[PDB]
Amino acid sequence: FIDISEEDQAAELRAYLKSKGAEISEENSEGGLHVDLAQIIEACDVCLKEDDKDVESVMNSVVSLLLILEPDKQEALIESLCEKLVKFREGERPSLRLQLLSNLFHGMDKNTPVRYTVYCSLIKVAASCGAIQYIPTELDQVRKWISDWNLTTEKKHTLLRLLYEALVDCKKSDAASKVMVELLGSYTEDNASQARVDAHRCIVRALKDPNAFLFDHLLTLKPVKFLEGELIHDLLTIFVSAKLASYVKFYQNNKDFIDSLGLLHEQNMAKMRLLTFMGMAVENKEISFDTMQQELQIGADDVEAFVIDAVRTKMVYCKIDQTQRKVVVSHSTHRTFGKQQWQQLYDTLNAWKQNLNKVKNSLLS
Amino acid sequence: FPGGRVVRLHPVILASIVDSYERRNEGAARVIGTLLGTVDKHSVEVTNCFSVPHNESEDEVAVDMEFAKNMYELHKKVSPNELILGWYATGHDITEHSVLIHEYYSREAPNPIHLTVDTSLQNGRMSIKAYVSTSMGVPGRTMGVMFTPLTVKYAYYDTERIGVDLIMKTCFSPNRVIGLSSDLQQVGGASARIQDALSTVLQYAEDVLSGKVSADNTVGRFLMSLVNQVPKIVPDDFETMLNSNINDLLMVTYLANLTQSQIALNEKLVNL
Amino acid sequence: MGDWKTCHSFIINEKMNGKVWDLFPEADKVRTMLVRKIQEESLRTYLFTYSSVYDSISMETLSDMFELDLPTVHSIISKMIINEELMASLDQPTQTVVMHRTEPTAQQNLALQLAEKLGSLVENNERVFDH
Amino acid sequence: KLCDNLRMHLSQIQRHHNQSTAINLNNPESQSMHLETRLVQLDSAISMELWQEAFKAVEDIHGLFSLSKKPPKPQLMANYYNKVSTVFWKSGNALFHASTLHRLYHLSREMRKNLTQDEMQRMSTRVLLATLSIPITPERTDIARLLDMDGIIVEKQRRLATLLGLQAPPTRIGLINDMVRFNVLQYVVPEVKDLYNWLEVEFNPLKLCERVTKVLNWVREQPEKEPELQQYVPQLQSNTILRLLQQVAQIYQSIEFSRLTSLVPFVDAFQLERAIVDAARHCDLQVRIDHTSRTLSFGSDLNYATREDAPIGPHLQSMPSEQIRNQLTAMSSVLAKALEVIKPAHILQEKEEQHQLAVTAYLKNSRKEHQRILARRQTIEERKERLESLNIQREKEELEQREAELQKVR
Amino acid sequence: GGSGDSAVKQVQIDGLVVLKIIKHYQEEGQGTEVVQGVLLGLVVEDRLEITNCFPFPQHTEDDADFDEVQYQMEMMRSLRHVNIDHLHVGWYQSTYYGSFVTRALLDSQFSYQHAIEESVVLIYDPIKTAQGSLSLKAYRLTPKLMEVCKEKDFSPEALKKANITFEHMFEEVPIVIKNSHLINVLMWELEKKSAVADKHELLSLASSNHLGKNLQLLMDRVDEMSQDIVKYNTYM
């Protein structure tokens, strides 16, 4: 590799760079020069012809990155040479190309293949190192502009079905689902038939991962209002067992994916955190010690055991007493209207509070 | 993964830019300097800088790197934390003259961490644009570069960010240092007000047709994140502790008013 | 530390190591005299140091803890209440000491009344010498 | 005589009649005199004096190692002089042991790199020797010494740690985290690693002494696991309870102490409940133990000034509840009321996009000020370089003016 | 308007000065009274507008030994290269106390003000004064004391100087009041955080909610005060 602070004239310059690369890159290095400047063909001679024995060429391919964007059609040719990156199965110097381009600098995230081709690349190029960095780079653009052509977002959803597991993760996986199902739920893949298998995956996401607290992230904004609850889905499989807290309530709700998963140990997690919360939010933020013995169908210090799990959950959060007042405020399991009514209570309660009290404040201010 | 991805800053960098840009050394638009800081394995921690007298022109680039050693001589004497990470200049981005400012910094040659201070009249134009140079091969002329973009963030000492937010309110309108805790109460009532102004409309959001979607079980939790702090749930022995803690710290305030006098009663008798 | 037992390791064995205990024929009594002088008084430093949060103090536990019988303990705890003048309710039929000192942040109010009372004295002494 | 020898070490060097250390002359003179210090100290000696004869030996000969191009094998002896002292500073001063056991391990870990020690059973067991004893620094018991100026003592606790090269004496938890962040915690023979991972992370107020005591008794198996370690166990089991009691104090507000007798399976009960107070009497947590029926409440908040914290900094993990102090309720009205204001709102988003433009009006004025300071303060940049710099020189010239005026009427 | 006694104006410290102070805030010297620099201003309308100031690095490992003047001679060279000359119109510290006038530093303040009477001496206060009012104290020393010079002396020139009765505190000037248009781009950094990269503004609001919850914001100050009250009063 040599300079690109030369005359520009970069295709003739990259031709002098392709002569250093592969011999098949070299035969169409200067053979691309006799015909034209050739912003496609000589520019495809990096895109077609391989990084010869190693990916040490990438300095010249960063030139071949930006040469097929501004003088030529950008995402037509950059869709090639990024599948060469996955094909060598290396993730460092391929990522040097993908970092230089990624979006909105050196090539203008349109209408998004500029993210997407680089986004599809570095998901396949890097397993869980560079593939993470484009997710907030998506998400900071998601709340500004998701790809309005939904198929790129569906292709991103295809990746958010892939990077759901192309990341070797469980909650970044679920975060990749929470980039997916958020954009699934609001506006992409509607296509309710596509929203079948996504909500079928959300049944997996709620019982393989029991961290919906029961169905509460699926009752927070819109996995229940878009992904239909009792449809072909039967997404309310989890939510029927989310309040009833015994084996028969799980096992008969257990379809043969869940009845063969199996659901036997997230049960008493779920039996806990509902009877914790629906003990707590009902009986009422100070519940008795022998009540949870009757709630959780257990003995004395096992109630004392599960409160430690429940305070570490921070669904309930205060100091506990040994003989009464077991589970307490910070309310993480779903209180669908009762916390909304409490939202309707507290915004009335704060209105009487802070307005009276800022007057008490501005007296001493 | 290739190293240069993110630069973390403070406005003390933007202080040292703009104080050397708004006393200016006659550098009407181009005020150029040398950033100093450290890196961490993918990230860059720039925490202070200073402007060397530069002159970037066609095709003159003046970099008094000996003074950028001498400023580094002074700053390493002051603060042993920072290393010369590059050169900062004002707007705008990639130039063939920066290729010269590469070379004066490539005389030193640590990793190329640039800071272009986009002197723009806009909002989306970022006031500090950071770049690492890619390809970055170049055994041929000076330094042929493409700038991989670097994102600018603020993560360093936090009461400086309490300080600069007071400075940004001093930027807004001073806001001198007189009332601060009493003024915090009105700020505490101001954040209280938009909370009530939003979430009662979030009551109204679902009450009109179909709002309070991202507020059903988030703002119900966002208010729960407050009421776990204040008020405690509603215990009356808590208030009895509180009214004791009224009468505790008021008695502390009472004896502070007593020691207000008795300090003077030794002071003013010996000044008859 | 308020532990009586730990003093006995540091004194009795070491004065036998240095033969200092080995000097009297009465020294077994003198040790046994100083057994209780360690037991009764480290019970006080047990009460003196842990004083703000002790608001109910046993007499059944302290008779078992510091190995001290009740007519000593009644001679301890009454003189812990009477002679030290600690605000302390006592029910010797119930064998219960109830103290409630109130307060440790107002100990700084005591620490400032340590300061400002000196303020009034030398202010008065400023006029005492000068007149 | 050891003071005499140290002087007839020093004054003989202070002769400097053809004598150096770098020929390894004074480095065995060290090795003799260091032994002369360290043996009598351990055997039977006053500790205040001969350890200064050791510390003045170790410090000067650290400079003589610095003179003689640091020899790592007398530094391995200095490591052993530390390793001697790690026994002694578990006998004499834990903050020195905070210095020396951290100096024990890394100066050995240097020799794991320098000498390439193939002691993969021992080095995996000297690291657990380096983890467990290293944090345990309880509350001081010295009430007179606080009146007798503790800051002089901690200075000497600092100063002879500056001698060893670990200048500030490190704490309980952050000194563990030195050994944790360094990858030798991975290299622990994994029972202690698990014994740590009960004591550190799996943090359950009723279910902690049940899982450590099995592994505490594991490392009580003495004959090969470094008999330093077996004295480190009950003082770790002492630090187990202080790790435990606050975790009981900050999930539970009133444990039943008759249950807490059973729910804490400590070896003793009377020395347990005494060490319960021996925490709380020295202000480590809130207990009500001399209730006559043997209960033990904690309270929330009700004592929340210093005594719950041991003494201002906790030893447990963040299971504590929301407590309230000075300007909580004001600053919770600042953030947790603005917690709905920045992200989910549009009410700030319409106000601060306005402010995004309200600055941009001033920023359009700022470019007018980018030319106005260019117009004004450039002229100030030259004039304040000259005119007001003469006014400092006026204060230097008027001083010369008053001198000649005073030299006229005398 | 902002004059004191016949030579001195108030100080006007814009925020771009302030940030370089809080680069060396209460660090590189935490329990060590770093004289954090000399206030290099300029004499303009009613106000000593500080332009840039340089933190003086005393030999700070656990103490403070006076370092090179060649530092100060090169910082005045570094500042003359790009900005205003060394018009030191004060000196400033913070430095580990709430509102204290250090007697030996007051003597360093006295001969400073005998040399340049146009001087106020800044005592910065971060949140270690528990916030807390008057976080910026540009305390100058009494010109009636600058009259009877030198200095305050112990048995002679103490009856003589206090029958004149020079004041003991005098003229803590109001410091920052105005948009001085050095403001310009840190105002423009405020609108961006305001704007959609607003993660850094709430973190400073997050610094409120935890400053009040668990710190002895009153008690640890008062315990340092009750320390300072029971000692310094009885010695007088």
Q: Is E229 close to C105, i.e. CB distance below 8 A?
A: no
Closest among E235, E227, E236 to E98, alpha carbons compared: E227
3-state secondary structure B224-260: HHHHCCCCCCCCHHHHHHHHHHHHHHHHHHHHHHHHH
Phi and psi based region of residue A333 (left: phi greater than 0; alpha: psi -120 to 50; beta: remaining): beta
Q: Which helix (H) or strand (E) holds B147?
A: strand B146-154
CA distance A34 to D92: 86
In chain E, residues with a C-beta closer than 8 Å to the C-beta of C108 are 219, 222-223, 226
Distance, in Å, from the CA atom of D369 to the CA atom of E180, rounded to the nearest integer, reads 10
- Taking CA atoms, A342 is separated from A16, A274, D117, D347, in Å, by 71, 19, 65, 21
Task: Map tokens 């959300």 to a residue.
Answer: A202
Per CB-CB distance under 8 Å, the chain D contacts of B165 are none
> What is the bridge-based pairing of β-strands C96-98 and C89-91?
antiparallel
Determine the number of helices (DSSP H) and then strands (DSSP E) in chain D. 17, 2
How far the first Cα of chain B sits from its last, in Å, is 77
Neighbours of chain E (3+ CB pairs under 8 A): B, C, D
Range B119-122, long-range pairs (CB < 8 A, 24+ positions):
B119/B21, B119/B29, B119/B90, B119/B91, B119/D367, B119/D370, B120/B91, B121/D360, B121/D363, B121/D364, B121/D366, B121/D367, B122/D360, B122/D363
Which residues share a beta bridge with E47? E10, E44
Instruction: Suggest the residue from E65, E85, E136, E189 to mutate for an interface test with chain B (most B CBs closer than 10 A).
Output: E189
CA–CA dist E115, E118 (Å, integer): 9
Nearest to A5 among B144, B183, B217 (CB): B144
Q: Report the DSSP pairing between strands A320-321 and B34-40.
A: unpaired
- B126/E195 Cα distance (integer angstroms): 11
β-partners of residue C97 are: C57, C90
Question: Distance from B10 to chain A by nearest Cα, in Å?
Answer: 21
DSSP, res E194: T
A347 interfacial to chain B (CB closer than 8 Å): yes
Chain breaks in chain A (C to N over 2.5 A) after: none
B70 contacts in chain E (CB < 8 Å): 74, 78
Total residue count of chain B as it appears in this document: 272
Tell which residue, B21, B2, B18, has the closest CA to residue B10: B18
The neighbouring-strand residues paired with B116 are: B89, B129
Residue E114 is which amino acid?
H
Report the Cα A120 to chain-centroid distance in Å.
14
Q: Which chain B residues are closer than 8 Å to E186 by Cβ?
A: 11, 14-15, 18, 164, 167-168, 171
Nearest to A96 by CA among A133, A127, A72, A122: A122
DSSP D208-267: SHHHHHHHHHHHT--SSS-THHHHHHHHHHHHHHHHHHHHHHHHEEEE-HHHHHHHS--S
Indicate the helix (H) or strand (E) that contains B149.
strand B146-154
> Alpha-carbon distance B169 to B219, whole Å?
28
List, as ranges, residues 261-280 from D with C-beta within 8 Å of C.
Answer: 270, 274, 277-278, 280
The answer to whether D133 and D87 are in contact (CB under 8 A) is: no
Alpha helices, DSSP H, located in chain C: 4-17, 27-49, 60-65, 70-81, 107-130
CA distance linking residue A254 with residue A186, whole number of Å? 28
Type of residue found at A326: K
Amino acid at A145: W
State how far residue E227 is from chain C, nearest Cα, in angstroms.
Answer: 9
Measured between CA atoms, the residue of chain D closest to residue C57 is D290
Stretch (H or E) spanning B84 = strand B83-84
Q: Residue type for A1, please?
A: F
Across the beta sheet with E43-44, the strand order is: E10-13, E47-50, E43-44
Q: Which two tokens stand for residue A321?
A: 């007493």
Residue with tokens 């003495």: D222
Q: Give the residues across from C105 on adjacent strands.
A: none
Q: Which tokens go with E102?
A: 């250090």
* H-helix or E-strand spanning residue D348: helix D347-375
Q: Could you give the CA distance from residue D345 to residue E44 in angstroms, rounded to a whole number?
A: 45
> After which residues does chain C show a gap where C to N exceeds 2.5 Å?
none
Q: What are phi and psi of B182, to 5 degrees?
A: -65, -35
What DSSP state is assigned to residue E38?
A: E
* Token representation of residue D255: 């444990």
Cβ contacts of A178 within 8 Å, gap of 6 or more = A217
Distance from C-alpha of A353 to C-alpha of C76, rounded to nearest angstrom:
53
Cβ–Cβ < 8 Å for C66, C22 = no
Q: What is the strand order of the sheet B114-117 is part of? A: B83-84, B34-40, B43-50, B6-9, B146-154, B129-134, B114-117, B88-90
User: Measured between alpha carbons, how far is B66 from D394 in angstroms, rounded to an integer?
Assistant: 34
What are residue D296's DSSP bridge partners? D255
Give the distance from CA A249 to its chain's centroid.
Answer: 31
Minimal-distance CA residue of chain A relative to D249: A319
**Distance from C-alpha of D303 to C-alpha of D326, rounded to nearest angstrom:** 14
Q: Are strands A320-321 and E47-50 parallel, antiparallel or unpaired?
A: unpaired
SS3 content of chain B, % helix, strand, coil (to 5): 45, 20, 40
Alpha carbon distance B265, E44 (integer Å): 42
Q: Which two tokens stand for residue A272?
A: 């806990």
Backbone torsions φ then ψ of B153, nearest 5 degrees:
-140, 160
Comparing CA positions, the residue from D327, D347, D352, B223 lying closest to residue A351 is B223
Report helix angle A58-66 to A11-18, nearest 10: 160
Nearest-Cα residue of chain D relative to residue B29: D370
d(CA B79, CA B49): 11
Do A47 and A80 contact (CB within 8 A), yes or no?
A: yes
Longest dimension (CA), chain C: 63
Q: Rounded to an integer, what distance in angstroms lies between the CA atom of residue B255 and that of residue C109?
A: 7
Exposed/middle/buried for D13, CB within 10 Å: 0-12, 13-18, 19+? middle
Pairing of strands B34-40, B83-84: antiparallel
Q: What number of CA atoms fall less than 13 Å from residue C127's CA on the CB side?
A: 9
- Inter-chain residue contact A311 with D319, CB threshold 8 Å: yes
Element (H, E) at B6: strand B6-9
Q: List the Cα angle C2/C7/C11 in 5-degree steps.
A: 160
C121 touches chain B (CB under 8 A): no
Kindly give the interhelix angle for D72-89 and D26-44, rounded to the nearest 10 degrees: 10
Where chain D is discontinuous (C–N > 2.5 Å), the residues before each break are none
The 8-class DSSP code of residue D315 comes to: S
- Pairing assessment for the beta strands B6-9 and B43-50 based on DSSP bridges: parallel
Q: For residue B91, which of B60, B123, B128 has the smallest C-alpha distance?
A: B128
CA angle A225, A228, A234 (to 5 degrees): 140
Which of E119, E102, E84, E110 shows the shortest CA–CA distance to E35? E102
Burial of D403 (C-beta count, 10 Å sphere; 0-12/13-18/19+): exposed
Element (H, E) at C56: strand C56-58
Q: Which resolution, in Å, applies to this structure?
A: 6.3
Is A266 strand, coil or helix?
helix
